[PDB]
Amino acid sequence: AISLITALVRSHVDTTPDPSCLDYSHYEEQSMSEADKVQQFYQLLTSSVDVIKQFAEKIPGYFDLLPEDQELLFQSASLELFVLRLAYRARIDDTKLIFCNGTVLHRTQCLRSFGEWLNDIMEFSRSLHNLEIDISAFACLCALTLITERHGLREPKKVEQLQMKIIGSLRDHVTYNAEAQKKQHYFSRLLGKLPELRSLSVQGLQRIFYLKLEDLVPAPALIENMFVTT
C-alpha cells in the first residue's frame, strides 16, 4: 500500500477545491441583511468542515480509532483545520478568499462576518508562506492539527502513536527535502505553527460566540460542537 505521507497528500488534494470547480455564486456583492451575512457564514463554515471531514476520514489509521475519539478529535480541531486551510490557500495582497467547500468571496464580504479576526488569519497566512511549506509538509501539518492530545480521549495513547507516525513521516520528508535544509531548524519552525493556529482559533471562537449571542439565526450543531472544547 501507499506511504502515510502520500496518503495524506492525496487526501489533501482530493479534498481541496480545484480551480476549475470553484463556486462563484456568492462573489458578486449584493444587498443582504446582517442576518443573511450570519446565515452565509454558518453555511460557509459548516460545509467546509464537512469537506474537512472527508480529509480526516482518509487519514490512514483514523478509522482504527474509536468513534468516540474520532468525534472528539474532529470537533476539537474543525475550526483549526478550517483556519489552517483557509490561511494556506490565501495569497498575499489578494482581494478574494477561497474556502475548501469551493466557495469564493471578497475579503470584504468576510470582514463583515469574521470581523477583525480575518486580518489575524491573513497575518497567519503570510507567516505560513514566509516559512514556505510544500504540499506534503502541509498535509502532515493538517493531520497533526487533528491527531493531537485532547482532554477526554478514550485511548489517548493510541492517538499519540498515530501522531508520532505522522511526525515521523514529516521528519523524514523534511530531512531529505533540499529547499528545507536551507533554513534554521525548519522542522521546529514548522511545528511551531500549530500553537499559533491554536491561538488564532481561540480568537475565532470569541467571534463565533459573539454571533451566537446576537442570535439572528440559529447556530448549526457543527458550530455548537466547536464550543464543546470548553
Side-chain angles (χ1 to χ4, degrees), residues 141-148 150-156 158-159:
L141 286 189
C142 287
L144 283 178
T145 300
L146 175 68
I147 311 309
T148 181
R150 299 294 194 188
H151 296 306
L153 284 166
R154 180 76 172 70
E155 299 186 273
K158 196 164 185 165
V159 170

Side-chain angles (χ1 to χ4, degrees), residues 92-111:
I92 179 177
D93 298 307
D94 191 317
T95 69
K96 68 178 176 171
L97 205 34
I98 298 172
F99 303 80
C100 56
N101 72 329
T103 293
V104 181
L105 306 163
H106 289 78
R107 300 205 169 179
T108 57
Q109 291 169 302
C110 301
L111 190 63

Side-chain angles (χ1 to χ4, degrees), residues 215-227:
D215 191 41
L216 301 189
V217 296
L222 200 53
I223 293 297
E224 288 280 2
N225 296 340
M226 305 178 156
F227 287 96

Side-chain angles (χ1 to χ4, degrees), residues 152-156 158-178 180-183 185-187 189-218:
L153 284 166
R154 180 76 172 70
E155 299 186 273
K158 196 164 185 165
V159 170
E160 178 184 56
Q161 290 174 181
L162 181 53
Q163 177 177 123
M164 278 305 107
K165 273 190 177 184
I166 305 170
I167 277 186
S169 284
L170 179 64
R171 181 96 66 181
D172 298 333
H173 179 73
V174 173
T175 296
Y176 304 109
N177 173 305
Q181 301 296 291
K182 303 178 184 173
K183 304 191 169 189
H185 205 320
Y186 178 88
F187 187 69
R189 290 168 62 185
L190 195 54
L191 298 184
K193 285 301 166 57
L194 297 189
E196 306 186 19
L197 181 59
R198 194 65 69 75
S199 300
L200 180 59
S201 157
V202 170
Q203 200 182 314
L205 288 177
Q206 280 151 37
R207 212 305 192 287
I208 299 174
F209 185 76
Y210 169 87
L211 299 182
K212 185 184 181 308
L213 292 182
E214 214 184 15
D215 191 41
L216 301 189
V217 296

Side-chain angles (χ1 to χ4, degrees), residues 6-30 32-33 35-49:
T6 290
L8 290 189
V9 176
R10 289 184 182 174
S11 306
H12 170 72
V13 176
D14 299 346
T15 60
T16 298
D18 48 297
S20 56
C21 305
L22 299 182
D23 178 37
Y24 297 94
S25 68
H26 299 310
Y27 177 73
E28 192 188 10
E29 291 177 0
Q30 296 181 64
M32 66 189 288
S33 64
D36 290 326
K37 289 176 198 167
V38 175
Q39 164 56 34
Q40 160 175 280
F41 173 72
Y42 283 158
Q43 191 57 55
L44 173 63
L45 190 34
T46 53
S47 63
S48 290
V49 169

Side-chain angles (χ1 to χ4, degrees), residues 27-30 32-33 35-90 92-111 113-148 150-155:
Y27 177 73
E28 192 188 10
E29 291 177 0
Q30 296 181 64
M32 66 189 288
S33 64
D36 290 326
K37 289 176 198 167
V38 175
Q39 164 56 34
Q40 160 175 280
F41 173 72
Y42 283 158
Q43 191 57 55
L44 173 63
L45 190 34
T46 53
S47 63
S48 290
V49 169
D50 285 325
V51 165
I52 290 163
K53 186 61 183 165
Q54 289 173 176
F55 161 88
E57 295 179 324
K58 296 194 171 196
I59 292 175
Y62 184 68
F63 279 143
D64 298 327
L65 295 175
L66 290 169
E68 314 190 339
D69 291 336
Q70 284 174 44
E71 183 191 356
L72 181 53
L73 291 179
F74 190 74
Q75 297 177 358
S76 294
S78 55
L79 186 60
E80 293 176 79
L81 291 168
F82 179 69
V83 176
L84 182 63
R85 273 143 88 88
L86 177 51
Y88 189 56
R89 214 177 197 303
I92 179 177
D93 298 307
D94 191 317
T95 69
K96 68 178 176 171
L97 205 34
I98 298 172
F99 303 80
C100 56
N101 72 329
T103 293
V104 181
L105 306 163
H106 289 78
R107 300 205 169 179
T108 57
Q109 291 169 302
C110 301
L111 190 63
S113 52
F114 282 69
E116 267 303 294
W117 174 46
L118 184 63
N119 277 325
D120 290 294
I121 297 179
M122 289 312 181
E123 184 152 344
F124 180 67
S125 177
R126 297 186 292 263
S127 178
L128 292 173
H129 302 304
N130 280 314
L131 174 59
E132 290 175 352
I133 300 170
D134 54 35
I135 201 167
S136 302
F138 183 66
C140 292
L141 286 189
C142 287
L144 283 178
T145 300
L146 175 68
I147 311 309
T148 181
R150 299 294 194 188
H151 296 306
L153 284 166
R154 180 76 172 70
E155 299 186 273

